[PDB]
């Protein structure tokens, strides 16, 4: 669905200093932009 890399590409910040925090923020960040 979406290489490692692309991850940060996705992301648009640091997926390292970002996945320092729970999945749970991530629910909101894929509603930002992504749709599911």
């Known amino acids: ?3 490692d890399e692309d991850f ?7 997926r390292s200093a ?3 925090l ?3 923020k991530q629910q909101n ?3 930002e932009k992504l749709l599911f």
Do not use: E
């Open 8 to 14: 940060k590409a996705v992301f648009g910040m640091t």
């Open 29 to 31: 960040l894929k509603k």
């Open 22 to 24: 729970p999945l749970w």
């Open 18 to 20: 970002f996945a320092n």
């Open 1 to 3: 669905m979406l290489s």
